[PDB]
Amino acid sequence: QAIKCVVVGDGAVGKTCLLISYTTNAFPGEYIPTVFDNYSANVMVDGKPVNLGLWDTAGQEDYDRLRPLSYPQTDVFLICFSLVSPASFENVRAKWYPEVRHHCPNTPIILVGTKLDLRDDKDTIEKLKEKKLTPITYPQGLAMAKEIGAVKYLECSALTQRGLKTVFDEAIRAVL
Ligand SMILES: Nc1nc2c(ncn2[C@@H]2O[C@H](COP(=O)(O)OP(=O)(O)O)[C@@H](O)[C@H]2O)c(=O)[nH]1
Ligand SMILES: [Mg+2]
């Protein structure tokens, strides 16, 4: 069974790094591909082989009209936000969940918090504190998930690859 998973969220949340890390088994560092592409993974999680088509999107305001053109035939969505970006977290309820439901009202959602490795980073915490902001905690993320009716809430880091295999395993689990 061939599954289709669309990845949505704000620019710089780490969507492309997440997809390259997972499929390639490596963090793309500084040079991240700039072409918005689709990826694939042949994975079997307690069954027979499954091909997971992974679709990256152009998250910026400029693509608001063209982005939903990749949504038709989608099996599951990954709404992404930076755990070290409250602006991207508010955009879950503000932008991403209304837009996903607009075009696909019955399609399952997995809420994904990225840059998990930066949540304990002293420099990142200091920068946020100056702007009177705090990183998103697991209870905050889980509440937003339940609010936006997400099937599951998951955290990960494409840098350390921690929680990454789970994200796409649960994407398959939200389908089937
Ligand atoms: N520390 C850390 N940096 C990351 C992670 N994922 C992406 N990045 C960085 O975050 C920025 C955004 O990456 P990118 O995939 O292009 O974001 P996109 O616009 O959502 O696709 C880049 O500077 C990446 O190097 C992560 O899990 N942890
Ligand atoms: Mg990208």
Side-chain angles (χ1 to χ4, degrees):
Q1 195 176 0
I3 308 174
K4 185 195 168 170
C5 169
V6 187
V7 189
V8 292
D10 289 9
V13 297
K15 282 182 314 303
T16 321
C17 281
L18 178 81
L19 297 160
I20 274 89
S21 294
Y22 177 67
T23 57
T24 271
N25 277 276
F27 187 70
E30 56 161 350
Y31 186 74
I32 307 131
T34 56
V35 174
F36 305 92
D37 214 344
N38 52 266
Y39 308 97
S40 182
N42 290 304
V43 296
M44 68 193 88
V45 56
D46 50 82
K48 278 190 177 181
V50 160
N51 187 262
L52 181 62
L54 299 146
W55 295 78
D56 201 10
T57 57
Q60 198 199 36
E61 256 169 69
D62 291 353
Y63 329 105
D64 283 15
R65 301 271 175 273
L66 301 177
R67 187 190 313 122
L69 292 172
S70 36
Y71 300 172
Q73 300 169 296
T74 175
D75 297 291
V76 66
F77 275 87
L78 297 184
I79 301 191
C80 302
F81 72 88
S82 179
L83 280 156
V84 305
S85 167
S88 66
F89 179 69
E90 283 164 88
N91 266 321
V92 173
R93 61 181 147 217
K95 184 180 187 197
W96 302 113
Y97 162 74
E99 197 178 58
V100 169
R101 285 288 164 252
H102 192 271
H103 305 92
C104 302
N106 306 104
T107 302
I109 294 169
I110 307 288
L111 181 56
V112 187
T114 56
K115 315 195 193 192
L116 174 70
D117 64 295
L118 290 166
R119 205 161 55 185
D120 280 323
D121 189 33
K122 182 212 75 69
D123 302 83
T124 308
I125 301 152
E126 262 277 293
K127 287 182 275 102
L128 273 166
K129 198 197 57 55
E130 298 304 323
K131 297 160 191 183
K132 280 152 175 74
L133 290 161
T134 191
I136 300 305
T137 66
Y138 190 94
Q140 281 185 271
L142 186 96
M144 182 68 88
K146 287 177 177 287
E147 184 225 289
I148 73 111
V151 154
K152 189 112 165 186
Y153 171 70
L154 291 162
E155 295 184 340
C156 67
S157 177
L159 197 154
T160 79
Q161 289 212 51
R162 197 182 306 273
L164 187 65
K165 195 216 188 297
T166 311
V167 164
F168 306 97
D169 255 1
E170 289 299 327
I172 295 148
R173 283 182 173 99
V175 192
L176 272 64

